[PDB]
Amino acid sequence: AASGSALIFDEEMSRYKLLWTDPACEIEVPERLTVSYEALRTHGLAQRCKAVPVRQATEQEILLAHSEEYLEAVKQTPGMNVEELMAFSKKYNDVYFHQNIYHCAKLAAGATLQLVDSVMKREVRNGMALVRPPGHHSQRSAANGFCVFNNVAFAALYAKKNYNLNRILIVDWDVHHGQGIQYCFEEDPSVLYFSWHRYEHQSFWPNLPESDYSSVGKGKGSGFNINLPWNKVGMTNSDYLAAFFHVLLPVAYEFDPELVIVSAGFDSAIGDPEGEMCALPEIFAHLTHLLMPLAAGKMCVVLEGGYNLTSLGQSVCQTVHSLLGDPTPRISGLGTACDSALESIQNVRNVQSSYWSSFKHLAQSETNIVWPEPLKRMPASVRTVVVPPPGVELTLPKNCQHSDISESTAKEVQRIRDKHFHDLTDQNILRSLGNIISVLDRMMRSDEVCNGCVVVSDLSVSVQCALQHALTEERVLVVYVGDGELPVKTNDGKVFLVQICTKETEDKCVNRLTLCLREGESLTAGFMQALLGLILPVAYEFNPALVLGIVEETARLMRVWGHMTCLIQGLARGRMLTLLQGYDKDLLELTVSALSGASISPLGPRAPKPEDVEMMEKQRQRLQERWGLLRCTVSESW
């Protein structure tokens, strides 16, 4: 029932700055805040967000993650002159103090709590806070790396105390390691901390041995801290997506968090002087999108780093775009991760194998400066178009609408009939072909309609008209559940077929991925592992212009179809056409709700069957040489 996105911001947090020459801190400027908000204003995103006000974090809230001694010392900084502020700043590592920074730090902390309360009270579905100073380096008794108070650490502890949450996920995609968060939740299994960061074999700041992949936590919390070190610069979109598909997402979806907090540092984007990575700002549209199915969309994005003012503004807009549900931009040129990234991904999965089900099979040997401006992202006039069987009135959300075959469209169905289906005059089945062409014409030719769902009776004729009409326009991904062959040719390079069936069928084709999941209670955990580890990696590298989902009537499927429909909307700008054979009121309502951008119910509780993981890893061995994004280990060299 929650809707809308909160944008917490206040220009007061830009009224402190570095007052002496210091090459280590010159990049942390107030302009990072003003450029970010002005970019959101230019693209119309701020106007679409609920402007929740900023407040000061109280002393009792600061003491949640900081000591009385450190709070008392920072509290005296407003009364210090420039000379005394230099003496206080050199007691810490790479951080400056201003006479207004204590005031702003309480605002940056209070802003994060305002976002947490807005999300947990269902007043908004998600939100982002544009705060300054950052926080993820701050520790219990020390300022560190431009950070005074650990804003994200506050949010997790705040949501624990005031809402009795048992599982909170923190995703730190800033290019630096948020060691302040790791120290805070080292022994806490209730707060899962994931962080990738420029490491370069401990040669990069903050040069900490505990920033490596071997630090998995301590005590009752071991396995709930996940560090992914980047040992070379220049990491690309393929490296970031490999990290998500093969490390973060498989852990996050079986952890099943009740709230997702993001340490959103954009110094991991291209052009940044600190990160020196090569990921485009568009990648953050998908990093946000792939996490939104978690915790029923309850996602609190908190700003951290980001120092290229041009790259910062573009990356912020791509994040808020996805938070508002706007379509995701297509990502081209995706392939395998580099050797250094595959090594880091390899080592993390190995050390985490003793803690998570998705990596359990790895433990035993019997099992195993200038870049182009991003395109304009615009939400469709109506997002989803539904056509139920004739005479079936349904209650649709405000994002949806029924079909009204035009005269030009009706002439198209006639010439198609008088060529391939000469003997076919069963009225309703013929009229379903008119709806398919009507929806597809509205999806591809204009930004009026994004996706749609069509209920059909005869499959082979319906899927043939759908696919052949979309091809005669570039590339279609087909995800079909059910058995038997379909009128789909995968000989050229225009179609990729994902089939989930019950009877095992040898593929012998590189453009086909057949998943034979054995019927059982663990079918939910098996499908989720194949979705994150196989289906999504090939779909993102394939980069289709349209997704065609097909569900035969003789469809277990109910629990996972919503998650697939949401996640798969990261492909093809969200343009997905779903063909459901037969009428299932529950399946159609679940399909339309996910297509319309609504939040999906969590899966909650596990571990899949070893025969399924064995089948899935055989699929990866057969396809990873063509689709490199499937690789999660370093390739063997001749």
Ligand SMILES: CC(O)(O)CCCCCNCCCN
């Ligand atoms: C939030 C954040 O992770 O971006 C903070 C970055 C800390 C920078 C460390 N000092 C490097 C000196 C550069 N010459």
Ligand SMILES: [K+]
């Ligand atoms: K990080």
Ligand SMILES: [K+]
């Ligand atoms: K932890």
Ligand SMILES: [Zn+2]
């Ligand atoms: Zn950073």
